C-alpha cells in the first residue's frame, strides 16, 4: 500500500540493530554501512512488519534479535517494512 518489501541475501549477519518490541513494535535502530540490508534500502526508523513468513508486529525484542541471528547464512531474506520515523523517534525512549 505505502510500504517496503525488500529481498536481500543474508551474509554473516543481517546487519540490523533493533529497537522497541511487544506493544510498540520492532524498529530498525541501525543498518550496517554498505550491507545488503542497506543497499536494499532498509533504514533506521523503518518498522519491521514481517520477516520471511513471520509476523513481527508483537514480538519481544530479544526473540526478534535471535530470530534474525537464526536466519541461515547465505540465504535470501524477505522483509516487509514501513517507514515510521516519527513514531520511531518517540519510541527510542
Gap between the terminal Cα atoms of the chain: 29
Q: How far apart (Å, rounded) are the C-alpha atoms in residues 58 and 32?
A: 24
Asked if residue 53 lies in contact with residue 77, where contact means CB atoms within 8 angstroms, the answer is: no
Q: Is 27 exposed, middle or buried (0-12, 13-18, 19+ CB in 10 A)?
A: buried
| Domains of the chain and CATH, by start | 1-93 (2.30.42.10)
C-beta of residue 60 within 8 angstroms of C-beta of residue 21: yes
The technique by which this structure was obtained is X-ray
21 φ/ψ sector (left φ>0, alpha ψ -120 to 50, else beta): left
Amino acid at each position: 500500500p505505502s510500504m517496503k518489501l525488500v529481498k536481500f541475501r543474508k551474509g554473516d549477519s543481517v546487519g540490523l540493530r533493533l529497537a522497541g518490541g511487544n506493544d510498540v513494535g520492532i524498529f530498525v535502530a541501525g543498518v550496517l554501512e554498505d550491507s545488503p540490508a542497506a543497499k536494499e534500502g532498509l533504514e533506521e526508523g523503518d518498522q519491521i512488519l514481517r520477516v520471511n513468513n513471520v509476523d513481527f508486529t508483537n514480538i519481544i525484542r530479544e526473540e526478534a534479535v535471535l530470530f534474525l541471528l537464526d536466519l541461515p547464512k547465505g540465504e535470501e531474506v524477505t522483509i516487509l517494512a514501513q517507514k515510521k520515523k516519527d513514531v520511531y523517534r518517540r519510541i527510542v525512549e
